[PDB]
Design an enzyme around this catalytic site. Structure first.
Site, PDB file in Angstrom:
ATOM      1  N   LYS A 109       9.827 -39.279 -10.213  1.00  0.00           N
ATOM      2  CA  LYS A 109      11.033 -39.317 -11.032  1.00  0.00           C
ATOM      3  C   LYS A 109      10.856 -40.355 -12.123  1.00  0.00           C
ATOM      4  N   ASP A 234      27.101 -46.197  -4.476  1.00  0.00           N
ATOM      5  CA  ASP A 234      26.951 -44.974  -5.260  1.00  0.00           C
ATOM      6  C   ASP A 234      25.700 -44.201  -4.855  1.00  0.00           C
TER       7      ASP A 234
END
Ligand SMILES: Nc1nc(N)c2ncn([C@@H]3O[C@H](COP(=O)(O)OP(=O)(O)OP(=O)(O)O)[C@@H](O)[C@H]3O)c2n1
Ligand SMILES: Nc1nc(N)c2ncn([C@@H]3O[C@H](COP(=O)(O)OP(=O)(O)O)[C@@H](O)[C@H]3O)c2n1
Lengths: 305, 312
Positions: A109, A234
């Site tokens: 990523k 989160d």
């Protein structure tokens, strides 16, 4: 011969660089232990060829590997052999920024500078936690961190282990974390990342039985208590479902067959289950920096079995 | 299997790292059907800035540059030298002796000037053409690689070539032959002195190689020096080393207290066994040296005439 032929040139450099750094590392002894400087260290190489080896690589590029000793040790603690890591990145170009190795074993990523800063701030405590749980964790498993420079533009990438099986197709996917749901836009792609609410309204459950469930819940509790003790939030739990029966529609890999050493997040369905399915579950997105979140997260995930 | 690159000085550690790196990188590069002209203008450059990492034997910061790598790889082939052999002789263990030799005594590494590198560049195309036309059989230096090292911001140019002497047969006496020159009382009292022409003439040593060996030697020496003249090159020498088989036998036996004169022409490529009817059983190593530079045509003629007069 490794040509490092790739779909894009940055991928050719990624392959060249992982090849280079893993070879370099194979000449560096394995230490009795990591030292604090190993957590501040870095490897950097700058390449300026001229009329040479330009068929697949740029003539000029830069490659930086962060904390090479740390991530090598992490790789070992996740049971991943260094040459296997190298082969998945260099035997064939990664595919589909978000990439997977040709063999679908590892994920690459692109990340921000800030995310790199955050990985550094957490790396010592994350390494210590990896060792404390003997590699058995639902957290992301970071296998290397790199900075690529090609055309004066730097690109940061993190390689980690895949949540899904590298051979079993994931038929449906959910991202669990207020209220969040998937768009008519998102819902119109091939395999949508459905958020929490749409999974609730759908009413799917995952029957893994008491024996499997108890130990899974143990590991999820450990991970989120750690992430809370670091004031991270989160983060999400990513979960994928594979329907053996749907998959149905000379050595033959069987139906719903997988290697648990390789697909390390996978769980077979309980005998008392509607359809025969295999599930993959793990925590994701843990680099964007409360404790209360830990509590709501664990309670949420708790009520599925 | 671990290569540590431990050396007495950081430059040799970088030398080993760089030959390792460039030979590995080269292993991923296809071997071309033929060389292209860009291969004679080409180079590889790497710059390494480690930090708190891999510092045991290498500098944290250094640069390594390789000249015309495709060309020297082809030269390696045309001299019968495998690339894996090359990297291993340079990197299994630090070279010793600037001018040094690999641990296994197979290859030699000389520091050179920037100008030497430019001259090697200007002559490289015709030298490669000459090597290929003679199927690798020459008394000239056999260049296997040219490198530039930067350590502590200092550039050091180095040329790797094949050793004139055998990697296994001890050289007992040696001369540098081309006016009049001789070895200094300083030189003449050293361990294995570099005797010049005059000490060879006043001493009266001769080399009994027999007719066929002599003839083939003189043929290739003529071809080689006419090449160097056709390159307007001069101040080169003939290097000559002597091995006494009988003495080697005794000194192996004397180290034992606490075949003989056989060698491999594939490996010891400047070597010649003594004639059957020769006083002592000897081995000779002879080659042209120092070709990275009063008339060159006269130089060729006089050189060939002189060297003709030291054989039987
Ligand atoms: N006839 C010929 N053809 C070439 N193809 C060639 N190539 C190099 N030489 C010469 O040697 C020096 C090598 O270092 P170079 O100076 O090239 O190294 P570079 O220029 O990268 O950086 P520097 O300025 O930090 O040294 C050169 O300056 C020249 O003196 C060449 N000469
Ligand atoms: N065994 C062996 N094999 C070789 N291939 C070889 N090549 C050059 N030598 C040495 O190069 C120097 C001449 O070269 P030059 O730089 O002009 O003189 P020095 O400055 O070094 O005194 C002399 O020491 C030669 O003996 C060699 N020795």
């Amino acid at each position: 011969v490794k040509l490092f032929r790739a779909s894009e040139p940055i991928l050719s450099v990624l392959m060249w660089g992982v090849n280079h750094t893993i070879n370099e590392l194979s000449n560096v002894p394995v230490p009795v232990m990591l030292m604090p400087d190993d957590f501040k260290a870095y490897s950097k190489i700058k390449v300026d060829n001229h009329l040479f080896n330009k068929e697949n690589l740029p003539s000029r590029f830069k490659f930086k590997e962060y904390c090479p000793m740390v991530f090598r040790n992490l790789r070992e603690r996740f049971g991943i052999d260094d040459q296997d890591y190298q082969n998945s990145v260099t035997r064939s170009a990664p595919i589909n920024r978000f990439l997977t190795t040709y063999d679908r074993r590892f994920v690459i990523k692109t990340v921000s500078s800030e995310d790199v800063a955050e990985m550094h701030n957490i790396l010592k405590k994350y390494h210590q936690f990896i060792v404390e749980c003997h590699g058995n964790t639902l957290l992301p498993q970071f296998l290397g961190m790199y900075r690529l420079t090609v055309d004066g533009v730097e690109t940061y990438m993190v390689v980690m282990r895949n949540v899904f099986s590298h051979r079993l197709t994931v038929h449906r996917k959910y991202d669990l974390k207020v209220a969040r749901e998937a768009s008519d836009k998102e819902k119109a792609k091939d395999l949508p990342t459905f958020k929490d609410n749409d999974f609730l309204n759908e009413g799917q459950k995952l029957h893994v039985g008491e024996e499997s469930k108890k130990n899974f819940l143990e590991k999820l509790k450990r991970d989120v208590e750690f992430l809370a003790q670091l004031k991270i939030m989160d983060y999400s739990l990513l979960v994928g479902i594979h329907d053996v029966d749907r998959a149905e529609q000379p050595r033959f890999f069987g139906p719903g067959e997988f290697d648990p050493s390789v697909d390390v997040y996978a769980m077979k369905s309980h005998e008392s289950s509607p359809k025969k399915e295999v599930y993959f579950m793990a925590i994701i997105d843990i680099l964007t920096p409360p404790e209360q979140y830990s509590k709501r997260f664990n309670e949420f995930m708790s009520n599925i079995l």
